[PDB]
């Protein structure tokens, strides 16, 4: 009793000191003296949970709740543990019980909201966050998580005040040395200073440091030359996204394109094999592939990386799902660089470089980054579109004047099919005249038919790819049939300008929708094409649009589509209107591969500048706006000056091939050049510095 209380206190004392193992030892001694000590079980469980020992933490939570049936806090913390163990149902049960025990327990309502949010149930997440905030008005975690929910569904009620409060909260948390409630991956969405955004990231970087310092591992010995590696630079790519994920859709060809005479590629997967061709390709083409998901201990995994003799370790996650930045905090490699996956600074001292470019990250704003800048010569962005979607390299149209984006055909065997037809016109875009063949295609689409056969060739309805070849739909395989894509498939007007944006709706803000409204108003024959991403955002966009004076028929929504259909249907738009708050990144590459011009207005953050970097590499400077007025003028020009539209569309169509934008071999070779710059700098005994020339 009294002795046990003292022991629990000393363990808490030792807990604050940082001596975690002594804390555990003292907690156990308390339990030895007084076994039925709920507080001691709860404290030990929390400590074990922090150490990552989740199963052991669970044991003690179960003890605590039995001894004290009104211990709502224990139920809540046990829920947090189950959530981390990926037992979502169990976590929800614990949060639900905590709320039943204590209806006024604000933290439990917030924790329940987060399960709903992570489960994609936004309206329910919002409801629970609002309850938390009613109980506890001063609740940074709940306020900021609520703000992101509202961002996801484009709820902009009291937006300006909301942003001010968010900045105020972060300013206060940073001042009081606490972990900011705004996630660094979201920090580009709010009007925070660059200083604040880097500071948020730095706080998370310090979390990793605090986790690894308890391992008490010494600094690793790093290689001083390439002698032990036969003159080859050993590059390790670390990612939780080797599989079906945008990251692999961008870079899956890169490991196999490395020059084996000078480079030895190690891919370290943080995720298990998801069975997709994306994972197959990387495992087959990398020199070495290591599944670190089978090695939970960051100490043992870092040891493995160091054993491999990695010279440059590449962080492809930053603060994204599946990341294990503790690996980088342990510094198993002499040079560690951020690349591609994370659109922002790590803020961490254990990351030496960020791989970017002059357009994305001009030297003037180097203070936005904790890392030194390492410039690729054109853009740091890349996409695997030339390999994944080669059927979109060429197109033909059906003329039912002549439009290039009303009824479109694509296929590996498209030329042969066209050769089977009479009266095919060439303008180089092949045009099929309105004949018996053309009526058969329209009939298929209207009847919702999956496919037909013409002259022995397979003609597929573009809306039905999952029923024909699911691997083709996901981008795992190149389609083997000829596909038809039409405006009628999506309810798009045959006689008007189509402006599109295929991003998640969270990237839109009031200023952006107003810009788009001004454009639509200036171009009578035009619609805006958006996605139900998520659907619950649709009525919010429509309401704001109506408030801006746009009837419902000016905005057209489509469901999110399988990967191939998403890229393919971009051919139906005239122009893409990029989101200035946070650009399309993967989605920018997606739209350009379809030959669709994209209007962008680069900001200051990395995430707001990626589209302009893409277009600069592409060779279309005329699509980059310096202000909102210019963005509007460019968009309206493209939608009203039809000869100019044709010119620009023709430019994008040609340049996606002739420019370096989608050239993965050239990209790999430039990446290799940059790697060697980094190494010879280190090899000369120098600390990291900007590589901007």
């Amino acid at each position: 009793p009294t002795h046990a209380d003292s022991l629990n206190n000393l363990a808490n004392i030792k807990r604050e000191q940082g001596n975690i193992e002594e804390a555990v030892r003292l907690y156990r001694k308390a339990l030895e003296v007084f076994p039925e000590f709920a507080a001691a079980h709860s404290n030990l469980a929390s400590v074990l949970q922090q150490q990552g020992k989740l199963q052991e933490a669970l044991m003690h939570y179960k003890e605590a709740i039995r001894i004290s049936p009104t211990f709502a806090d224990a139920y809540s913390n046990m829920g947090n543990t189950l959530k981390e163990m990926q037992d979502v149902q169990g976590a929800l049960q614990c949060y639900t019980r905590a709320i039943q025990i204590n209806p006024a327990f604000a933290d439990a309502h917030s924790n329940l909201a987060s399960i709903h949010k992570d489960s994609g149930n936004i309206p329910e997440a919002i409801a629970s966050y609002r309850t938390a905030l009613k109980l506890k008005p001063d609740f940074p975690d709940a306020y900021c998580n609520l703000a992101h929910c509202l961002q996801i569904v484009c709820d902009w009620t009291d937006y300006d005040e909301r942003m001010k409060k968010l900045v105020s909260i972060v300013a206060d948390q940073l001042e009081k040395n606490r972990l900011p409630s705004v996630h660094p991956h979201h920090s580009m969405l709010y009007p925070l200073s660059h200083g604040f955004r880097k500071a948020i990231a730095e706080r998370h970087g310090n979390l990793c440091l605090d986790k690894i310092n308890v391992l008490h591992k010494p600094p690793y010995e790093h290689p001083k030359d390439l002698k032990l590696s036969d003159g080859r630079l050993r590059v390790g790519y670390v990612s939780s996204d080797f599989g079906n994920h945008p990251t692999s859709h961008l870079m899956q060809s890169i490991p196999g394109m490395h020059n084996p005479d000078k480079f030895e590629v190690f891919c370290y997967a943080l995720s298990p094999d998801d069975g997709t061709n994306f994972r197959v390709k990387v495992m087959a083409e990398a020199n070495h592939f290591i599944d670190l998901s089978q090695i939970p201990c960051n100490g043992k995994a870092a040891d493995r990386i160091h054993q491999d003799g990695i010279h440059i370790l590449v962080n492809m996650n930053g603060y994204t799902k599946g990341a294990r930045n503790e690996l980088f905090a342990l510094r198993p490699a002499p040079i560690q660089a951020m690349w591609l996956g994370y659109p922002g600074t790590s803020g961490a001292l254990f990351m030496d470089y960020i791989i970017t470019d002059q357009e994305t990250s001009p030297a003037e704003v180097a203070e936005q980054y904790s890392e030194k800048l390492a410039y690729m010569p054109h853009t740091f962005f890349i996409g695997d579109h030339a390999n994944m979607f080669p059927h979109l390299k060429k197109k033909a149209v059906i003329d039912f004047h002549i439009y290039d984006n009303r009824i479109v055909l694509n296929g590996i065997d498209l030329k042969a099919f066209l050769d089977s037809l009479p009266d095919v016109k060439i303008v180089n875009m092949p045009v099929i005249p309105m004949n018996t063949i053309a009526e058969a295609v329209i009939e298929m689409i209207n009847r919702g038919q999956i496919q037909i056969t013409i002259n022995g060739f397979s003609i597929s309805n573009g809306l039905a790819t999952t029923q024909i070849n699911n691997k083709a739909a996901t981008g795992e395989e190149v389609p083997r049939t000829i596909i038809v894509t039409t405006r009628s498939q999506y309810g798009l007007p045959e006689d008007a300008i189509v402006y599109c944006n295929f991003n998640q709706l969270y990237k839109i803000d009031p200023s952006t929708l107003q810009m788009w409204a001004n454009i639509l108003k200036r171009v009578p024959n035009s619609v805006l094409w958006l996605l139900r991403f998520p659907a619950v955002g649709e009525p919010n966009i429509q309401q704001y649009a109506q408030n801006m004076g746009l009837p419902q028929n000016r905005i057209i929504f489509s469901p999110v589509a399988p990967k191939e259909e998403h890229v393919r249907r971009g051919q139906l738009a005239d122009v893409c209107l990029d989101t200035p708050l946070c650009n399309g990144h993967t989605t920018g590459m997606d739209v350009l591969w379809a030959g669709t011009p994209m209007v962008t207005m680069p900001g200051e953050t990395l995430a707001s500048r990626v589209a302009a970097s893409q277009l600069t590499c592409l060779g279309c400077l005329e699509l980059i706006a310096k202000n909102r007025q210019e963005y509007e003028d460019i968009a309206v020009k493209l939608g009203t000056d039809l000869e100019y539209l044709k010119k620009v569309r023709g430019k994008v169509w040609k340049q996606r091939i002739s420019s370096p934008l989608f050239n993965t071999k050239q990209y790999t070779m430039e990446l290799e050049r940059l790697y060697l710059q980094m190494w010879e700098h280190y090899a000369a005994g120098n600390k990291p510095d900007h590589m901007i020339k």
């Binding site: 972990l179 079906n244 945008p246 996650n317 996901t474 469901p559 399988p562």
Partner: peptide
């Protein structure tokens, strides 16, 4: 996409 999955960039847990 409805009926399947569309992976996206996701923030890690904190």
């Amino acid at each position: 996409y409805p009926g399947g999955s569309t992976p996206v960039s996701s923030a890690n847990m904190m």
